[PDB]
Amino acid sequence: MRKYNGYLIDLDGTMYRGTERIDAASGFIKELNRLHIPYLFVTNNSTRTPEQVADKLVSLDIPATPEQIFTSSMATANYVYDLDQNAMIYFIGEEGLYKALKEKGFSFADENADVVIVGLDREVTYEKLAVACLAVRNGAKLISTNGDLVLPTERGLMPGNGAFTALISHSTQVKATFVGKPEPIIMEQALKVLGTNKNETIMVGDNYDTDILAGIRAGLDTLLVHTGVTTVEKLKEYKQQPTYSMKSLDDWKFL
Amino acid sequence: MRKYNGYLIDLDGTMYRIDAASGFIKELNRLHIPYLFVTNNSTRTPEQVADKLVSLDIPATPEQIFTSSMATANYVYDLDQNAMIYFIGEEGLYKALKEKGFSFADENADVVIVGLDREVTYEKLAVACLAVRNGAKLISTNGDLVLPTERGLMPGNGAFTALISHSTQVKATFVGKPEPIIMEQALKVLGTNKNETIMVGDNYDTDILAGIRAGLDTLLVHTGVTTVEYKQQPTYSMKSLDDWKFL
Secondary structure, three states: OOOEEEEEEEOOOOOOHHHHHHHHHHHHHHHHHHOOEEEEEEEEOOOOOOHHHHHHHOOOOOOHHHHHEEEHHHHHHHHHHHHOOOEEEEEEHHHHHHHHHHOOEEEEEEOOOOEEEOOOOOOOOOOHHHHHHHHHHHHOOOOOOOOOOEEOOOOEEEEEEHHHHHHHHHOOOOEEEEEEOOHHHHHHHHHHOOOOHHHHHHEOOHHHHHHHHHHHOOEEEEEEOOOOHHHHHHHOOOOOOEEEEOOHHHHHOOO | OOOEEEEEEEEOOEOOOHHHHHHHHHHHOOOOOOOEHHHHHHHOOHHHHHHHHHHHHOOOHHEEEEEEEEOOOOOHHHOOOOOEEEEOHHHHHHHHHHHHHOOOOOOOOOOEEEEOOOOOOOHHHHHHHHHHHHOOOOOOOOOOOOOEEEEEEEEOHHHHHHHHHHHOOOOOEEOOOOOOOHHHHHHHHHHHOOEEEEEOOOHHHHHHHHHHHHHOOOEEEEEOOOOOOOOOOEEEEEHHHHOOOOO
């Protein structure tokens, strides 16, 4: 009887910025739970495990289990696995991406890898990057968990995953396939895990350029919150608009 | 009397991958025509490059080597003699910058110089990006995307420059070939006029284009990158340095 029986909730943007937004998210998510509506959180983040993210949400009174956290690194692992579970993987990345690949039981290799996966590695080295280039020139498919050129830290704007992918792409003259938002691949992979139908699922977020655009491209209806008169006007000039725009999660009716 | 009285000569693929190169250079010495080797190489000192040439029976003194490191050090000196420098690179670049009198800094640098560092790290790249976002000028020794080795086609300095430029949204100023910066300097060092100077090389995309944009005649010998199989032709194209007639 509901139009939407599955929710993909963005973890990024400014969705949980400040106590008011945190409380609104708590209210919204608790309501989904009370209604027994399945939901999954989606993020491009590669520096926290599903367990850490869930522990964090729970501490903010937003109910989540590790199984409800879905990252671009997980989407990337799962996407590659469905295409060739016997591919030998070379990856650049940290514990999150390693774990997602481990979950899929991959074999790993260096210069003769079948697939090269580029994730953010804050201890990357020339040699790690060289092996990626060599494997790509040996015919490996080139996959990038996301395209972000910058990683915000307290030091300032550090090089992001996308910058490293650009290095490899430029050196090898091979284009990467990108998985994370704003690409639709992460959202199709999230839909797989959530288990609901595309036309009965909605993606909720508050960033258009990176986050909600992914849902639009993946063929999902979208709710963009934290909008205002000017941003709504701005979106009307773009090729694609979110399905709905509202000020607050508080305004959403469960249909 | 001769049309060309000065020679700028590429190393990588022209002088070595070859004893046609040796004969060519010695004939230059016998005809007493000055020459300068010009290389995008940012890792080696001129002493090391010259020694390698000697060991191959190619007459070269360190003073006849002009690298992208030396050119970059000169170029930065022209912009600001007192620049605080953050650099990524190896011995060659470090030495060139130090010899020029520069002091070094990190995130607070005035100028960020990107040269090849085969032991570069995330942190080294991050410092570069932070300095650039802080307002540092972004300079690169060379734009080569690949470094050919026995393992295969390794990432070259242009690939690392691209990472930094993409992350920071700041375009780099490139010094080495095919940019005219290294050429105009080399020309000053060689000391001959443009119309009597010829650039000799094997790669169209670096060597020949460098000559064209510097307004120099060019000689493309097919002993390296570019095959016989572009919008501007080199002045001359031949299969071997043995075919050159010393015009």
